[PDB]
C-alpha cells in the first residue's frame, strides 16, 4: 500500500511511455529517416548511470533528431527496421542550445506529442486526454493485479484475455474506452476481472434478422439468451449493458419502450466476461462467445457491427466452412474459430435508415467457443502471450521456462519460433495467395494452443475484418447479394496484401520475436532469417502466383499502418494511415 | 564509445565509492547523519536511479551534511560499517533546490567541502591527490583491460598486481607524487619490472641485523657481493630512492671522494608489489623491502633506524614463540623477516647518521611462495577487490573452484573456514602474548589449496607492537630506549588497531565482496564471527575482558582515513554487527 500506488504509477508511465515511443519510432522517426545510433557529442544533463552499467554500456543509443531543435535520446539493446526493441534507460530530451533533461510523464507526453503534431502540421488535444486517460487507467490494473505470479495470464484462456495490462503495444492509448464516464470502467474491463449480466430486451419476433449456417434461427436466438422469458410472438436479445445505455437515448427506442412494442428487460441476461476486444464477452462451457455493437472508440475505430457487416458475417462463415470442407489442401492447415449465427432487430415497419440504424445497435455475432475443443489451460491469446507482466516483464520467458523444465537455451528459442511462426504463416499466406481471401491476423485475432508450452495450432478469428480481393477472393460470393454488402468485402489485391503484411510482420511476428530476442538480442535475425526462409518455402507450395512474395522475400520495404499519424492527419488524408519500414533481411 | 572513456567512467566510479565509504564510515555513522528514507521531494532525481520497471533499486540512504547539503544514494543493505555496494548515482541537493548529479570534480568537491566542515580542519593538497589518483587508476584499467577480471586472483604476484583501486576506503588510493621518473615503470598495476639501484659501500658502515643467517648470508639476500671490493659490500635500492640519494650533498661528497660507489640499476631484476616499496623476485629466496621517500596512502613510506632495529628484534620474537609456544599461536603462519642492512659513514654525527641509515634501509622478508605456492597463495586485499568491471572477483574464482554455482551454504562454509584462520593467530598472539599485529587485507595473504582457504598468511613485523602489560617484556633490558619506544602500544591502542583491522578493514570487505547479490548472507556471516569469538576465547590463556565486550555486542573501533588525511591515527566507533 502507499508505497504500492507510486511503484504501481511508475511502473503504467513507463510502459505508457513505451508504447508512444514504439508509434514514434515506426510511424515517424524511421521512415523519415530521423534516427541515429549515435552517442550525442555533449551528453551535459545525461547522469553517468543512465547509459553506463559500472563496466560497459547499457545497449546502444539511439537519438532522434525532431522538428522545433528537439532531439531525444534513450539507450536500447538492439538496432532494429520495424522499431522493435527494448529500451535500456530513461528518455532524455534536448531543446536547441538547453541541455538534456528528464521530464515527468505529462511533460514528456506533451512534448512528444507536440513533435508529431508539428510534422502533422495539426494538432490532436484529445487525444492527448487519452493518452493520459489510458496511463491512468493502466496505473489502476497494475495496483488491482499485484498479486499472482507476473506470468499468471498464461495460464488459462480467459486469464489470458484478461491480463493484457498495457493493451496494443504500439498505440498511443491502447486503453482509452470513450462511453460516458459516469457508466464507470472498472466494472466493464476484464482487467479487473469485470463480470456482468447481459442487458436484456423483449422483441417482437417480425422485426428480428437472423443469420445462421448449421444451426437453426431457434438456435442462433437460444445461443445469446434463455428464451423462456419471451412471450408468444417475441423473443429475448441480449446487449452490452453500456450499448444498452447508448441505444435507449435514441427518442426511436424512448417510443418503442413507451408503446410495450419492445421490453427493457434490464441486466437479466447470461453472466459473461468481457474479453481483450471488450465488446466480445466470455462463458466458460457455453459453446459461444457473444459478440455485440458497441458504439464507442476503443483504440482505432468505433466498435459497432454496420449492418452490411452482419451480413458479410454470414456469408465469411459459410465461406470458410467450404474451404475448410473441400479446399483443405490449400488451406495450409487453417484452424479457425466460426461464427455461425448472428441476431439484430429492427421494427418491421420502419424505414431503410431507421431499420439500419436499429439493426447496428442491436447487432449480435456467436463466435465458436474453441476452448471446447482447444481446452482453457492450452489456449492463450497472442497478444498477451508476446506482452510484458505487471513486472514489465516479457511472459513467455517464465511460462516456456516452466514448461521446459529449465532455462532454455537459443536453440530451444529458435526451435520454438519456427513452430509458432510456420502455423501463422502458412493458413495465412495460403488463403490470400491461392483463394484471395484476407485475414486480419494481428495479436488480439489470433490464439495459441500449445502442448506443454510447444505451438500446436495458432486459431485465428474475427470474420467481420475479413476482405475477399477484386481478383481472386470477391469470386466466391453470389451475385445476387446486396451492393453494399459486396462493397464492404471487397479490397484491392495491393489492399489485401497491405494489411497482411502489416499484421504478419510488424503487429504480430515482431512482437513474438521481440518477447522471445529479451536479455538475447542476437537471435533476432536469426528468428527473421527463419521468417525468410519460411516465406521461400511457403511460395513453393501455393497455387496461385505470389509475386508480392517475391519482393518481400527479395527485402523490399514492408506496409506499417498507423496509430498515431492518423489521428493526427485529417479523416480525408488516407496516406497516412501507413508508411513504409525497411525489410528485416535484404 | 572508446575504450578510454569507458575508463574514465570505471575510474571514476570506483574513487567516488571509495570516498563515499570514507563520509558514511568516517563521519555520517559516528555522528549519527546518516538515514535510510525516501526523500519527501525526489524532483531531479530520474526514475531509472531508483526503480528498474518492477520494484525499487535497494534502498534509499540519505545523508544530512553541512550548510543545508543533502546527499542521495541506493544502496543494496543496511550495514553499521558502512559496508554496501552502492545501486545508483549520488545525487546532491543544497538549500531551496532540486536533486543535482554533479560530474566527478564537481562532485569530490563538495563532497571534501563538507568534510572539511565537520571536521574542522583542510589539508590543501587532498583535493589534487584525489583527482591524481583517480587519473591514475584510469590509466590502470585502460592498461589492464584484456585478460579475464578474475586473472588478478591466479597466481601471487598478479594479485599483488591487481589491486586496481587499491585501499577501498581511502580518498586517494592510488595517489602517488613521484619526484621526472614516471608512474609505469615503478607501477606494480603496470606489471612493472626493474633492475635494483646498488652502490659498493665499505663494510665499517654497515648495520646488519640477521636471525638464522650469518651477516654476510643477509648481504647475499639483496645482492651478489661478487663484485665488491676488499673490506667493501653491495647494497641495493629502490632506484627512485637512488636518485634522491645521489642528490643530497652528503652523498655527492662520498662518491667525490671514492668512499661509495655507484653501480648503477645492475642488481636484481624484480617487481614491485602492491606496497610500492616491497620487491618480489620468483625463486629467490627473499622479497627485498626498501625504503622510499614517497607518500603511499597515508605514510611516506620510509624507515627509520629504530623501525631497522626492531625488525630484528620481532623476527627474533616469532621465532621464539614457535620454538617454546606454538600451541598458544592459534595456527600462527607468518612470514619471517630474517635480514636487514642499513649504511652509514663510519664517522658521521647521529643526525647524519640516522639520516643515511633510513636511505639505505633494506628488509628481507622470507619469500613465501617457495613453501606455499604461487598459484595457491593471494594477498587477501586482491582477494576481496574489485575486477576491472567492478565487480567483485571471488565470485568467479569461487565458482571455477567449486564447479558450480555456489548455494548460500557453501558461502557461508567458505567464509567460517576463512575468518577463522584469521581472527584465531591475531586473537591469540594479542591476548596470549602481548603481540599486536596489524591484520589488515594487505598484510595478510590467503593460501587456498582448490580454493579451500587453508591459512591466512600475516606479514609486515614494522607493523607489529607489543603491549605495556604484557607483549613488552619480550624486550631485554639492554635495548635501545628509541627502539622500545616505537615498540610500545598500551593495551587499549593495541585493541584498537585489532579491532579496526580484523573486522572493518577485512571482514566486513570480505563479507560484502561474498554476498554482493545476497545482501542477506551479511549478518549470518556476522553471527559466524561472533560464535568463533566465543569459541576462540574459550581457548585463551590470559584474560581477556576486551574480548567479552566485543561479543557483547559493544562498539568497534575504525580508523579514520579521510581525517588522518584532512589532518597531515583518531577512531571513530561504529555499532557491533550483531
Ligand atoms: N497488438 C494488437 N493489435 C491489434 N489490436 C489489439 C492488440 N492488442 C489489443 N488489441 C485490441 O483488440 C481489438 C482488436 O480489434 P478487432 O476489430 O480485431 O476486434 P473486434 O472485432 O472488436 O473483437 P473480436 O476479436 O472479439 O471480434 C481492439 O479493441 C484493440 O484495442
Ligand atoms: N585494505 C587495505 N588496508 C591497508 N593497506 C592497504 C589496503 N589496500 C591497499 N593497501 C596498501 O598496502 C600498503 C599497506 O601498508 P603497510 O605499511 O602495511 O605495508 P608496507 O610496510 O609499506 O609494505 P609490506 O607490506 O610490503 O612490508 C599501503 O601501500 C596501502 O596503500
Ligand atoms: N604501521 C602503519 C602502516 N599502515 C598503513 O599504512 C595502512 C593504512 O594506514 C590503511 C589502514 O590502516 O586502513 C594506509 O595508509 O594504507
Ligand atoms: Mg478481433
Ligand atoms: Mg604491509
Same mark, same amino acid.
Given at each position: 500500500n502507499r508505497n504500492h500506488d507510486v511503484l504501481s504509477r511508475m511502473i503504467s508511465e513507463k510502459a505508457a511511455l513505451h508504447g508512444l515511443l514504439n508509434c &514514434?519510432?515506426?510511424?515517424?522517426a524511421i521512415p523519415e529517416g530521423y534516427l541515429r545510433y549515435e552517442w550525442p557529442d555533449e551528453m551535459k544533463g545525461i547522469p553517468p548511470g543512465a547509459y553506463f552499467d559500472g563496466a560497459d554500456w547499457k545497449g546502444i543509443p539511439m537519438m532522434i533528431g525532431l522538428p522545433d531543435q528537439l532531439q531525444l535520446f534513450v539507450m536500447v539493446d538492439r538496432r532494429d527496421?520495424? %522499431?522493435?526493441?527494448?529500451?535500456?534507460?530513461?528518455?532524455?530530451?534536448?531543446?536547441?542550445? +538547453?541541455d538534456w533533461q528528464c521530464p515527468d510523464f505529462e511533460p514528456l507526453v506533451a512534448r512528444l506529442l507536440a513533435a508529431c503534431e508539428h510534422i502533422a502540421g495539426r494538432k490532436n488535444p484529445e487525444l492527448y486526454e487519452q493518452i493520459l486517460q489510458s496511463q491512468r487507467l493502466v496505473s489502476a490494473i497494475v495496483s488491482h493485479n499485484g498479486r499472482q505470479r507476473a506470468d499468471a495470464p498464461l495460464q488459462h484462456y480467459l486469464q489470458s484475455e484478461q491480463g493484457l495490462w498495457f493493451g496494443h503495444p504500439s498505440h *498511443? @492509448? *491502447?486503453? @482509452?474506452? &470513450?462511453? *460516458?464516464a459516469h457508466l464507470g470502467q472498472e466494472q466493464w474491463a476484464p482487467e479487473f476481472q469485470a463480470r456482468a449480466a447481459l442487458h436484456q430486451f423483449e422483441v417482437p419476433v417480425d422485426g428480428l434478422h437472423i443469420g445462421a449456417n448449421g444451426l437453426t434461427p431457434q438456435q442462433v436466438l437460444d445461443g445469446f439468451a434463455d428464451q423462456q422469458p419471451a412471450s408468444p410472438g417475441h423473443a429475448i436479445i441480449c446487449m452490452h449493458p453500456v450499448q444498452?445505455?447508448?441505444?435507449m437515448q435514441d427518442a426511436r427506442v424512448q417510443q418503442l419502450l413507451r408503446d410495450n412494442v419492445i421490453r427493457d428487460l434490464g441486466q437479466s441476461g447470461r453472466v459473461a466476461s468481457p474479453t481483450a476486444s471488450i465488446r466480445t464477452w466470455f462463458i466458460d462451457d457455453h459453446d459461444y462467445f457473444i459478440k455485440g455493437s458497441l458504439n464507442v472508440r476503443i483504440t482505432n475505430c468505433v466498435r459497432k457491427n454496420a449492418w452490411y457487416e452482419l451480413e458479410s458475417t454470414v456469408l465469411i462463415? $459459410?465461406?470458410?466452412?467450404? &474451404?475448410?470442407?473441400?479446399?483443405?489442401?490449400?488451406? %495450409? +492447415?487453417?484452424?479457425?474459430? @466460426?461464427?455461425? +449465427?448472428?441476431?439484430?432487430?429492427? *421494427?418491421?415497419?420502419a424505414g431503410e435508415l431507421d431499420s439500419h440504424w436499429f439493426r447496428e445497435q442491436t447487432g449480435g455475432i456467436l463466435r465458436e467457443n474453441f476452448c471446447r475443443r482447444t481446452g482453457a489451460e492450452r489456449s492463450i491469446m497472442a497478444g498477451t502471450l508476446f506482452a510484458r507482466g505487471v513486472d514489465l516483464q516479457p511472459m513467455i520467458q517464465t511460462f516456456l521456462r516452466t514448461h521446459y523444465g529449465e532455462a532454455l537455451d537459443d536453440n530451444a528459442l529458435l526451435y520454438w519460433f519456427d513452430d509458432y511462426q510456420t502455423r501463422l504463416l502458412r493458413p495465412v499466406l495460403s488463403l490470400f495467395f491461392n483463394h484471395g481471401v484476407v485475414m486480419e491476423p494481428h495479436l488480439q485475432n489470433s490464439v495459441l494452443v500449445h502442448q506443454q508450452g510447444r505451438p500446436q495450432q495458432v486459431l485465428l478469428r474475427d470474420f467481420e475484418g475479413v476482405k475477399l480481393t477484386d481478383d481472386l477472393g470477391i469470386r466466391y460470393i453470389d451475385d445476387d447479394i446486396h451492393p453494399r454488402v459486396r462493397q464492404s468485402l471487397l479490397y484491392s489485391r495491393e489492399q489485401g496484401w497491405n494489411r497482411i503484411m502489416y499484421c504478419l510482420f510488424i503487429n504480430h511476428?515482431?512482437?513474438?520475436?521481440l518477447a522471445l530476442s529479451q536479455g538475447r538480442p542476437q537471435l533476432a535475425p536469426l528468428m527473421w532469417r527463419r521468417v525468410q526462409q519460411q516465406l521461400r518455402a511457403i511460395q513453393g507450395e501455393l497455387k496461385q502466383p505470389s509475386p508480392e512474395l517475391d519482393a518481400l522475400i527479395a527485402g523490399h520495404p514492408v506496409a506499417c499502418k498507423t496509430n498515431l499519424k492518423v489521428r493526427l492527419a485529417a479523416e480525408a488524408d488516407?496516406? @497516412?494511415?501507413?508508411? $513504409?519500414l525497411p525489410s528485416p533481411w535484404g
Open positions: &514514434l519510432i515506426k510511424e515517424f527496421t520495424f %522499431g522493435s526493441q527494448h529500451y535500456l534507460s530513461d528518455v532524455y530530451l534536448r531543446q536547441a542550445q +538547453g *498511443p @492509448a *491502447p486503453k @482509452a474506452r &470513450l462511453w *460516458p444498452a445505455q447508448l441505444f462463415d $459459410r465461406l470458410f466452412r467450404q &474451404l475448410l470442407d473441400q479446399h483443405a489442401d490449400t488451406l %495450409g +492447415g487453417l484452424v479457425a474459430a @466460426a461464427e455461425p +449465427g448472428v441476431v439484430s432487430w429492427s *421494427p418491421a415497419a511476428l515482431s512482437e513474438t520475436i488516407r496516406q @497516412a494511415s501507413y508508411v $513504409r
